[PDB]
Ligand binder design. Sequence first.
Ligand SMILES: [Mg+2]
Ligand SMILES: [Mg+2]
Ligand SMILES: [Mg+2]
Ligand SMILES: [Mg+2]
Ligand SMILES: [Mg+2]
Ligand SMILES: [Mg+2]
Ligand SMILES: [Mg+2]
Ligand SMILES: [Mg+2]
Ligand SMILES: [Mg+2]
Ligand SMILES: [Mg+2]
Ligand SMILES: [Mg+2]
Ligand SMILES: [Mg+2]
Ligand SMILES: [Mg+2]
Ligand SMILES: [Mg+2]
Ligand SMILES: [Mg+2]
Ligand SMILES: [Mg+2]
Ligand SMILES: [Mg+2]
Ligand SMILES: [Mg+2]
Ligand SMILES: [Mg+2]
Ligand SMILES: [Mg+2]
Ligand SMILES: [Mg+2]
Ligand SMILES: [Mg+2]
Ligand SMILES: [Mg+2]
Ligand SMILES: [Mg+2]
Ligand SMILES: [Mg+2]
Ligand SMILES: [Mg+2]
Ligand SMILES: [Mg+2]
Ligand SMILES: [Mg+2]
Ligand SMILES: [Mg+2]
Ligand SMILES: [Mg+2]
Ligand SMILES: [Mg+2]
Ligand SMILES: [Mg+2]
Ligand SMILES: [Mg+2]
Ligand SMILES: [Mg+2]
Ligand SMILES: [Mg+2]
Ligand SMILES: [Mg+2]
Ligand SMILES: [Mg+2]
Ligand SMILES: [Mg+2]
Ligand SMILES: [Mg+2]
Lengths: 260, 155
Amino acid sequence: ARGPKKHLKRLAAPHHWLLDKLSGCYAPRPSAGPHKLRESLPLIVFLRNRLKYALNGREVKAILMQRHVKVDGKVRTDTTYPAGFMDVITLDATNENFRLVYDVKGRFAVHRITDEEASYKLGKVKKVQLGKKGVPYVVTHDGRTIRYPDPNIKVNDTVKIDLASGKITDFIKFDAGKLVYVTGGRNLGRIGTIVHKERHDGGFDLVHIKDSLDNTFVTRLNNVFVIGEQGKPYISLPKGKGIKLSIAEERDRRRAQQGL
Amino acid sequence: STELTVQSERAFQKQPHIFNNPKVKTSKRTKRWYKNAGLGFKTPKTAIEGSYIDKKCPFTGLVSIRGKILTGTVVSTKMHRTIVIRRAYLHYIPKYNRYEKRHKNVPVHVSPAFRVQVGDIVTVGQCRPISKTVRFNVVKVSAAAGKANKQFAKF
RNA sequence: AUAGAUCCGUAACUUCGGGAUAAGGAUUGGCUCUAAGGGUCGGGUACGAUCAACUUAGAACUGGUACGGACAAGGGGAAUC
RNA sequence: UAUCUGGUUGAUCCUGCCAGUAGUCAUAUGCUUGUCUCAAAGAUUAAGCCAUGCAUGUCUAAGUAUAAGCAAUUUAUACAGUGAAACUGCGAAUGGCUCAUUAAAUCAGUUAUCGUUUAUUUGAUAGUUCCUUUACUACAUGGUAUAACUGUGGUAAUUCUAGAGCUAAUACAUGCUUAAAAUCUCGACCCUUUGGAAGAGAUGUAUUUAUUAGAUAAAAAAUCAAUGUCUUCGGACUCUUUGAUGAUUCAUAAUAACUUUUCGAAUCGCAUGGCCUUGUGCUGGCGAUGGUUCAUUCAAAUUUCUGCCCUAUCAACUUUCGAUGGUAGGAUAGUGGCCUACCAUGGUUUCAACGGGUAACGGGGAAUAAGGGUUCGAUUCCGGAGAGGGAGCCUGAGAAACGGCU
RNA sequence: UGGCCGGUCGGAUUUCCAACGGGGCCUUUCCUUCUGGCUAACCUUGAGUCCUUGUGGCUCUUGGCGAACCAGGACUUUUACUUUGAAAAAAUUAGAGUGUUCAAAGCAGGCGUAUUGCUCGAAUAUAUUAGCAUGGAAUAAUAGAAUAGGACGUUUGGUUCU
RNA sequence: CGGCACCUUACGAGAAAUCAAAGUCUUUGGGUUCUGGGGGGAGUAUGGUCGCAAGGCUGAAACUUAAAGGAAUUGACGGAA
RNA sequence: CCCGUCGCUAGUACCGAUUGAAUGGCUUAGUGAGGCCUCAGGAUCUGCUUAGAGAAGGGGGCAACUCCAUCUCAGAGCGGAGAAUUUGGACAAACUUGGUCAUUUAGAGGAACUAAAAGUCGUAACAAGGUUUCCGUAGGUGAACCUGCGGAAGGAUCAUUA
Ligand SMILES: [Mg+2]
Ligand SMILES: [Mg+2]
Ligand SMILES: [Mg+2]
Ligand SMILES: [Mg+2]
Ligand SMILES: [Mg+2]
Ligand SMILES: [Mg+2]
Ligand SMILES: [Mg+2]
Ligand SMILES: [Mg+2]
Ligand SMILES: [Mg+2]
Ligand SMILES: [Mg+2]
Ligand SMILES: [Mg+2]
Ligand SMILES: [Mg+2]
Ligand SMILES: [Mg+2]
Ligand SMILES: [Mg+2]
Ligand SMILES: [Mg+2]
Ligand SMILES: [Mg+2]
Ligand SMILES: [Mg+2]
Ligand SMILES: [Mg+2]
Ligand SMILES: [Mg+2]
Ligand SMILES: [Mg+2]
Ligand SMILES: [Mg+2]
Ligand SMILES: [Mg+2]
Ligand SMILES: [Mg+2]
Ligand SMILES: [Mg+2]
Ligand SMILES: [Mg+2]
Ligand SMILES: [Mg+2]
Ligand SMILES: [Mg+2]
Ligand SMILES: [Mg+2]
Ligand SMILES: [Mg+2]
Ligand SMILES: [Mg+2]
Ligand SMILES: [Mg+2]
Ligand SMILES: [Mg+2]
Ligand SMILES: [Mg+2]
Ligand SMILES: [Mg+2]
Ligand SMILES: [Mg+2]
Ligand SMILES: [Mg+2]
Ligand SMILES: [Mg+2]
Ligand SMILES: [Mg+2]
Ligand SMILES: [Mg+2]
């Protein structure tokens, strides 16, 4: 009550952060930023827990205040900066770049990309609108206002942002037969192609997505992120490619990989 | 609804920011603003061609239909431009594996584009709060025959 | 001491008629207004002149918070024989 | 983990309860208690009262340092390191505790904002600043007025402060310089009409009102009122620009103005490059902090649908004094009887309204587990509510805040 | 599911088939249309059955059921039920993995050369009602054409609107 | 065909007496209303309502208690045969 | 075997004069603090200014009724901030009286019930319980009860087409 909340309880954190139940009563509440609180990953959770580069939060602060990390080409010395989907994290020492993409279990994966791919990102168009003095702007899924877009860019399209000069290099329409990265729900992290979009004027347009193994699934259009054509994605996909093997095929993979 | 005293109040009843220019006589008499409410709800020709005002009408007024689209039997047309509908349903008690008849009384604003009476099935749509109890407008009336053509007397 | 009038509110008990003006409480002048409440007068083989009475309700303003301004005008309640 | 047994009789078979029996993240108590791991714990009764101490403060290269503080000699006689105090900024609205209130209320799942406010973050964003231009007053940079401090005091006492003397700012109050065009409006000189021009003002963005645009399923022709860009005056005519939504009076743009006129950088650190009329001239980097509007994020507020225990020894309730609705206003951040004014007489109810009780905060959940159920949930997570009871408010983006005030 | 070249010392295969479970089409066939492109598994088939077999290959087919779906529809009987799918926070419950020395638990951990480190994980299910989307059309309601204000439509008028 | 009943049997039911319904019930669901939850206290107290009254309808609790009761068997007893 | 009246003892509720008492709601009416909004107020504490000594060219100027300018004091020039105080509102604590609801409780005394089996009196019921019992109603009686009227068999008769 009475104002904005500043603490996140552990067990009230997002589950994909994979924080242990014990070892403290609180979770790192993400700062305000480009991504929503339950659909982002703070830098302390990325550095301390995923990469294991820091043992404490004191060491995460000691890493960030030397201006080592940079998210989307800018330094971001906050401990709980909300690095969400599509975000490129460059660590200049260790010479590596990560792209925050989901794994197929619904969790942000440690996914190392190249320095060429670290020079851009993708952004789902949230609105196309006319700003003041009659200037068209487009808003992506990470809060970026980009002025003077292509007039063919509509909502649910995907733009390619250049991360140094934040312009639209090119874009991908929302048509049947283009790759999807599912960014929400129980189908989160899955990758497939649009069969068709079911309209439902009034609310919650649905998308029927079919993956490479011909498994169709239905997802709301808030959770659909176009990443490329049929095949040939504009980003580099993580290990697993968004296939969602069942648990029987998962233990079959584990027994076929650990026996040598 | 081109009659029955539009200017019945102490204020001049007009649609706001709709201007009838007296210097240049318009080709169409008394310019009217209307809209389609959306969701396949046809704006009636009485709403298009009438003379009523009704600032809470979903077609000629300033409200927008968004949210739930309910359906109910009219039980009371005893207010001015507001009806009460009965939304009867069935509630499931899981102990007895059985249902019970229930009902809810929903007060709905009605435009004078629609002529409704007790017994009509109306389709209502959620709008912003119209009054203390009213959050819905009638957007469609679904009683054309109503078995009310053969009751009259014969020779 | 109470008291007229208007509005509110009214218990036990009862023979259901009362008790009851129960008890108890607000308002009340002046002035300027407003709104309702009528009678007679014409139609094609939807509306106006005109006349008049005092009742009621409301509002603003106003004053040494006065106003049933003199007069007139119930004190009430719980019980017993 | 689908189980029964003792007790009515002289004996019997039943109904039937009593008693046994077994769990309890279910409390208390008795006796006893060696080791390891884990761990609840003033909820029930008294949301009763509180001694004391603590729990909210915070400074980086980067707002203000003349401490008459400490320490050191450097582009450093403006300052330069560090720094009490104090001003400014931000936070104090989170956390923590408790369950008193509360029975469609909170709350849960689900919607809505085309009905709103939103600090911060993140992204975008500001050449227009002249009162009535032929009356501008520094921009190589305006002003005073205060703390800290000094010094003089009052009270028994308080995180009480008074009088006097100083001095700062990213405090307070003012104020400025940045194209080049277009388009309107006014307009001393076009005579025989389809006959124009100097030079003046205005146009950023906020606020408020009014008006306009914000189009659009297809195709030809007919005179005209006047032609419209330009004529081979036959008359060629192509093209005007229109985004979004299921939907708008949306976004946005335009016109006329309006405004105890909002914003449009008089701020700070580090580095000191580049050019030639070598003037400490013109340019110039990486940041910090501000700042208008939009978007985003964190939210907030309100809201659709459906769901709550017992009670009829509660059957009618609401409408005086807003109860249901309409119109208009006010108020609000905004919808709305939220409030006001004038009208209408509605609205809820045996599908249980209204009232009464609750030793009731709601939920995720917990105990018992054939299945169905029954009972518990003050309590580690979510939401609400509260700070002894009520009420009122200040500051602020956010409080009707109580380790804020009245 | 396999079912037999058992040729891998009782383990690929499958018109050799049966039992299930779906979708079409035709049987008088109940479900819609109209605006413009997808040129239907090109209705057709110049090129042609060069490929050898039979029937598993009929192609740049002559305009082609332009019907392989996008938005404003002469466009609408409403429900209950049930299937499926999004949602129903985490902790908890059930449960997978993992010698916390066991276990309750925890989400760890495991493997080299310990020299420039490699790597699997943190699954899954249930979460009941109500709301959303979707398949079914039994069961149970509901509505239609009876003073015909009934349907169509290749008719022909008229009015009025855009 | 409809009715008041009756006799035999026990398919079945029941604790049994007995029942053509008291059957079609652990192989438990044709539709519906009312009522009961060990015996007393108690149909009492109180409230409401009806009645002229008598009372009628509705209707507890504190407390107390290990049985009360139903059907049948054997005995005993009968101012029963 | 059993039933009542009466009798001691203990316990539990009920009625009960006491306008009994207490607590907590809600509420009419009266008084009504405080802050907030508002009509006023103006302690002060100030910048410019004079047409009057104000010992001060009105800043290109001391002749075309003409190009932003200060000091003692009076002010006839203004303008801003602004405390105490104060007017009217809406919000409204809290107090007084009255109303009603929910809960708790003192109470002389009365009428019951149970513990409860043994006391005194009788023997109502169980046998045809010695008047068959039991229900409804009415009256009477020390008490179980008796009597009337209608009913039932749970009777002591399933029966006299004898
Ligand atoms: Mg809190
Ligand atoms: Mg944080
Ligand atoms: Mg209204
Ligand atoms: Mg009186
Ligand atoms: Mg009296
Ligand atoms: Mg008066
Ligand atoms: Mg015995
Ligand atoms: Mg027991
Ligand atoms: Mg040891
Ligand atoms: Mg204590
Ligand atoms: Mg306590
Ligand atoms: Mg401060
Ligand atoms: Mg901050
Ligand atoms: Mg208004
Ligand atoms: Mg309004
Ligand atoms: Mg009113
Ligand atoms: Mg409580
Ligand atoms: Mg059981
Ligand atoms: Mg609970
Ligand atoms: Mg709880
Ligand atoms: Mg409690
Ligand atoms: Mg809490
Ligand atoms: Mg609070
Ligand atoms: Mg206390
Ligand atoms: Mg308090
Ligand atoms: Mg603050
Ligand atoms: Mg408070
Ligand atoms: Mg405290
Ligand atoms: Mg606090
Ligand atoms: Mg284990
Ligand atoms: Mg017969
Ligand atoms: Mg009983
Ligand atoms: Mg009775
Ligand atoms: Mg009685
Ligand atoms: Mg009996
Ligand atoms: Mg017996
Ligand atoms: Mg006595
Ligand atoms: Mg006898
Ligand atoms: Mg006898």
